[PDB]
Design a protein around this ligand. Structure first.
Ligand SMILES: [Zn+2]
Lengths: 23, 142
């Protein structure tokens, strides 16, 4: 199960990083 | 064991003052200014991605750390950045919320310590070459 969640947190946490990185 | 009644009284006075300075564009310390920045990056993270916090997964005190040390390993599997560190923190918060949802409160104290020592032994390095915390504050403050 879990692995998929760790992956998910890697993703949305990149969308986020992208956001404040672009600013 | 119990520490100073004055150190207790001073700790609250010092807390309530930082908050008022942070609101008026000041900060007691680098530690105070970083805390608030993370608190708000966190809520911002919560807001943007509430979907992915749901019911996360046979949460028992039994395989708790095991299941924990693995999600985090996987999280930074191929590198750290400012967004994953936030992804990291917000992750511990729900565990603590979802844990007290089962009276597993006792799991909360242990959780904190897994993060502090991980962030110390593994997140601390990256953070340091990458500008410091001061750098985060600028990217993620307000
Ligand atoms: Zn005690």
């Amino acid at each position: 199960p879990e692995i998929w969640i760790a992956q998910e947190f890697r993703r949305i946490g990149d969308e986020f990083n992208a956001y404040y990185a672009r600013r | 064991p119990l520490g100073s009644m004055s150190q207790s009284n001073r700790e609250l006075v010092v807390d309530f003052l930082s908050y008022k300075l942070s609101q008026k564009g000041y900060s007691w310390s680098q530690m105070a200014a970083v805390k608030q920045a993370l608190r708000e990056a966190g809520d911002e993270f919560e807001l943007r991605y509430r979907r992915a916090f749901s019911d996360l997964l046979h949460i028992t005190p039994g395989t708790a750390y095991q299941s924990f040390e693995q999600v985090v390993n996987e999280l930074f599997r191929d590198g750290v950045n400012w967004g994953r560190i936030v992804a990291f923190f917000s992750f511990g918060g729900a565990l603590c919320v979802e844990s007290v949802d089962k009276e597993m409160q006792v799991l909360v104290s242990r959780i904190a310590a897994w993060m502090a020592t991980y962030l110390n032994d593994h997140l601390e390095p990256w953070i340091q070459e990458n500008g410091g915390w001061d750098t985060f504050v600028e990217l993620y403050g307000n």
